[PDB]
Design a protein around this ligand. Structure first.
Ligand code: NA
Lengths: 156, 78
């Protein structure tokens, strides 16, 4: 099918060349084969930012009409960030079909776009009250919270 | 398949290419990488698909595929 052939292409591309320190791996079915509709991913914090040292786990869930539609990208556990909903779902315009999603966007581009969002929040379109309010009212406390979260999710 | 092509990438953007036997311990690739880059074994750790590569792991055991990427990180030295 259209989704599965594109996702097999994306997997082969990712395995050969991907940004350093990221992870993107399909989950498995009971029979040991890959479930290309549900990927376990991880995004590293950028060096020189308060996110440095963290590795932040995310699930990427594809619908059967992918790549007409973007995947849903959900931090697990939910992330403290102004543009991450309490559910963990990421708000980003490239991840909305009727905003900036384009079918040609690759998994590398999605994960690099989420990485960029981490240290560059969009305060025009907040997704959670807590991280947004702290970002606006108390940047010192915001950075303390971010550095603590990065430590919590640092690889051992 | 007797051999597999692999590349080792670092955060400094380096990319070093290898062609190794599928059933040989990856210790031997790690040792080659250290010789080529002029650094000691205790200074690096190597990951594949987000997991540490043991000296006794082989490409076959790990399910590696032609032209796979392996990541090299600096270890605490420390
Ligand atoms: Na949204």
């Amino acid at each position: 099918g259209i989704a599965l052939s594109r996702l097999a292409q994306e997997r082969k591309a990712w395995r050969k060349d991907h940004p350093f320190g990221f992870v993107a791996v399909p989950t498995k079915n009971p029979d040991g084969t890959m479930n290309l509709m549900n990927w376990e991913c991880a995004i590293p914090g950028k060096k020189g930012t308060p996110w440095e040292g963290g590795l932040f786990k995310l699930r990427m869930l594809f619908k059967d009409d992918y790549p007409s539609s973007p995947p849903k990208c959900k931090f697990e556990p939910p992330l403290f960030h102004p543009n991450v909903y309490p559910s963990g779902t990421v708000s980003l315009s490239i991840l909305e079909e009727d905003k900036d999603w384009r079918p040609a966007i690759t998994i590398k581009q999605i994960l690099l776009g989420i990485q960029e969002l981490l240290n560059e929040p969009n305060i025009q379109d907040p997704a959670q009250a807590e991280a947004y309010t702290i970002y606006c009212q108390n940047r010192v406390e915001y950075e303390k919270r971010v550095r603590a979260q990065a430590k919590k999710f640092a690889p051992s | 398949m007797e051999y597999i092509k692999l590349k080792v990438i670092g955060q400094d953007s380096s990319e070093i290419h290898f062609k190794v036997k599928m059933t040989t311990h990856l210790k031997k690739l790690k040792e080659s990488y250290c010789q080529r880059q002029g650094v000691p074994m205790n200074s690096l750790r190597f990951l594949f698909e987000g997991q540490r590569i043991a000296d006794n792991h082989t490409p076959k055991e790990l399910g590696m595929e032609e032209e796979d990427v392996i990541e090299v990180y600096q270890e605490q030295t420390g």
